[PDB]
Design a protein around this ligand. Structure first.
Ligand SMILES: Nc1nc2c(ncn2[C@@H]2O[C@H](COP(=O)(O)OP(=O)(O)O)[C@@H](O)[C@H]2O)c(=O)[nH]1
Ligand code: ALF
Ligand SMILES: [Mg+2]
Lengths: 310, 132
């Protein structure tokens, strides 16, 4: 009773985070010692994040609110967790101009967990800091290649394959493509106003759509349950207030509200299905870093797989 | 011959693992099983490129660019647009440090993703445990 499961989607859509949730829900949690191994990652994320904002400022020619921050920025580069570095990061982060550049993060490349970490620097910068489970889920590590994980759920033995990401990794996907029972295709909802890290000219959501069109309609997956995770819905909810969906969909005639714009995105992906007669896309709006939400959604997905291979 | 202590020191750092040709091979094998060997093959191509002679660098640079860096490379390394563009500009009149930028990003990618997993894999553990 094996289930071959593919976690697919464009770079940074949340595939590795769902894999982490699978370890938490099905293989019982992250221990204190495992969490402590993620300290360095959290620091690396926080540090590379504030550096990215500061470098953007140079290129976008944004001034600091207060010019004393210039010396903090220089110190940041030389330093890059000490109490000194912490204080450098806190002061930069609270500065009006760094904030200005932060709100313009769509013009460069910034980790989505930047704020989460940078707003909790007091907690993170303590000497005896132990990452919480959520801190681990929020970490960023670029996946390259194909990684196989095993776990058992509802008496089904999942062989789960997690992949990269970027255009460069996608040529390698064919080596997973045989005998697939289910695909969870992840899309970053909040990517609608961003650009590919590997191609500054291509809107990330347009990429995700073209990639889903290719996967959904692939003849290898005619007998495969195609599940669509419209992920990062929490980030999307915050963003759609600030940044209009028309940046991605110029024809979009509706309101910039969470529920209408979410529905429109759903329908844009669901229309790519060119076998609506024989094949159903199983769509869920997810927050991959929310364990509770991934547990509920994965339970539904597993029931869809039972019903489809029964 | 290859030691036990030696293999344990591979858990200290990626630099120590890639310091010697044995460790390169073993880690290489691991990357092959994860379909990411192009990263190490690229890193090794940059290392040879650095020792390569002033005279032949234009060809060596073009070769490596085509094989690993370009959009359509068969062993295309996972790097961003800005890094790929600045490498592209350097291929025309290439110096010995031409690929340093891309090399660093592929080292960091191997170091942060592939390497922590290597240390927990059968390949490494079976090697380590069979020598004791
Ligand atoms: N807030 C939020 N963050 C997310 C969500 N999904 C992923 N992330 C974060 O986004 C980053 C990229 O996620 P990752 O799983 O590595 O993307 P991958 O390239 O598809 O594997 C990580 O730091 C995650 O913690 C989400 O639904 N909400
Ligand atoms: F950007 Al990714 F896994 F797809 F690290
Ligand atoms: Mg990943």
């Amino acid at each position: 009773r094996e289930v071959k499961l593919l976690l697919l989607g464009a770079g940074e859509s949340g595939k590795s985070t769902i894999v982490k949730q699978m370890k938490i829900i099905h293989e019982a949690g992250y221990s204190e010692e495992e969490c402590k191994q993620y300290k360095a990652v959290v620091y690396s994320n926080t540090i590379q994040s504030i550096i990215a904002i500061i470098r953007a400022m140079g290129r976008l020619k944004i001034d600091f609110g207060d010019s004393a921050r210039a010396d903090d920025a220089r110190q940041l580069f030389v330093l890059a967790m000490t109490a000194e570095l912490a204080g450098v990061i806190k002061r930069l982060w609270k500065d009006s101009g760094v904030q200005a550049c932060f709100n313009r993060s769509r013009e460069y490349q910034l980790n989505d967990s930047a704020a989460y970490y940078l707003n909790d620097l007091d907690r993170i910068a303590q000497p005896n800091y132990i990452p919480t489970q959520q801190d681990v889920l929020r970490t960023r590590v670029k996946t390259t290649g194909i990684v196989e994980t095993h776990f058992t759920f509802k008496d089904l033995h999942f062989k789960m394959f997690d992949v990269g990401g970027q255009r460069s990794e996608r040529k390698k996907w064919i080596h997973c493509f045989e005998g697939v029972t289910a695909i969870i295709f992840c899309v970053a909802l909040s990517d609608y106003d961003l650009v590919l890290a590997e191609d500054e000219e291509m809107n990330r959501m347009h990429e995700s759509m073209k990639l889903f069109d290719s996967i959904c309609n692939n003849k290898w997956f005619t007998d495969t349950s195609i599940i669509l995770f419209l992920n990062k819905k929490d980030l999307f909810e915050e963003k759609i207030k600030k940044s209009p969906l028309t940046i991605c969909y110029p024809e979009y005639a509706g309101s910039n509200t969470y529920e209408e714009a979410a529905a429109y995105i759903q329908c844009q992906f669901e229309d790519l299905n060119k076998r609506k007669d024989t094949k159903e896309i199983y769509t869920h709006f997810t927050c991959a870093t929310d364990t509770k939400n991934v547990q509920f959604v994965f339970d539904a997905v597993t029931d869809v797989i039972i019903k489809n291979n029964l | 011959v290859l030691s036990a202590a030696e293999v344990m020191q591979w858990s200290q750092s990626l630099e120590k693992l890639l310091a010697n040709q044995t460790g390169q091979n073993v880690f290489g094998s691991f990357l092959k099983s994860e379909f990411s060997e192009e990263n190490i093959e690229f890193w090794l191509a940059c290392e040879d490129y650095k020792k390569t002679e002033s005279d032949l660098l234009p060809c060596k640079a073009e070769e490596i660019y085509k094989a690993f860096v370009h959009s359509d490379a068969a062993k295309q390394i996972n790097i961003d647009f800005r890094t790929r563009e600045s490498t592209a500009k350097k291929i025309k009149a290439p110096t010995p440090t031409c690929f340093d930028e891309a090399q660093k990003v592929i080292y960091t990618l191997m170091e942060k993703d592939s390497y922590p997993r290597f240390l927990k894999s059968d390949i490494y553990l079976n090697l380590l445990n069979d020598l004791q």
